[PDB]
Symmetry: C2
Subunit: 153 residues, 2 copies
């Protein structure tokens, strides 16, 4: 029905938070949309960062979390849309995306309509930082889910 990917540097913080927040909202409206996560940089890690997951249980998410992923050339073909958290994520994604698919790429907040266009980098920051981060990503999420709700007539 629709396949969506979200990308950050390591797939530790922002893309999984994005992916979890996205799945809840897609689910609450029974939308045939699936979402994943993935990083640009490969990590030793297996699971998304703890601080990152605390911040989302504090807001009432009980998340079945997917293991860390780095982005793979099949993703540029598999997924109908690919969202970037900050533009450093979006450049690195473009140094690698087939020219046949650069049209899939857009930043996360792109549909927000807000002073925010990038999602800053929470890695190893205060828990309070992650609160705001979760909200920025949360707002970006509902815009998308409401947007997607529209193209279907």
């Amino acid at each position: 029905g629709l396949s969506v990917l979200v990308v950050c540097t390591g797939n530790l913080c922002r893309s999984p938070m994005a992916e979890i927040i996205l799945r809840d909202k897609i689910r609450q409206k029974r939308l045939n949309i699936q979402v994943r996560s993935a990083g640009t940089l490969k990590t030793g890690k297996t699971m998304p960062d703890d601080k990152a997951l605390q911040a989302l249980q504090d807001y009432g998410y009980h998340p079945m979390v997917n293991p860390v992923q780095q982005v793979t050339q099949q993703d540029f073909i598999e997924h109908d849309f690919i969202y970037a958290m900050d533009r450093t994520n979006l450049a690195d994604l473009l140094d690698i995306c087939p020219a046949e698919h650069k049209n899939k790429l857009a930043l996360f907040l792109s549909k927000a309509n807000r002073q925010e266009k990038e999602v800053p980098d929470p890695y190893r920051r205060s828990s309070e930082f992650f609160q705001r981060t979760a909200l920025l990503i949360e707002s970006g999420a509902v815009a998308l889910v409401d947007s997607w709700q529209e193209q279907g007539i």
Copy 2:
């Protein structure tokens, strides 16, 4: 529908692995069932240990995992069944379950045709150990789902 809870001591290793494998098998059997994990002991951690997550990948399980909870009185009334990995897990469980629900407890290996029916502690031993534990947990999960198909 159905609810099943699998408990161990930390909810770091065994109850998590039991949680994935049941999902896989309930999937394969397209059954009206879902499963949770939970610890008995309190812990200030957020994700099951890695060595436990890999042991399922080696076996081709996608370890998409709920984070670590400790057991709460809510678990005794949300779920239909509760399973202990240890018998030590079963003492701790019985110390707190209301009298009208102790008929929900069982060991995890309850329906396995195997002699000893505890699932030992992978903490925090070699991956080969985690490999064994996975099959012991994997073996356990097969017998549960075959009964549930008729436990009615």
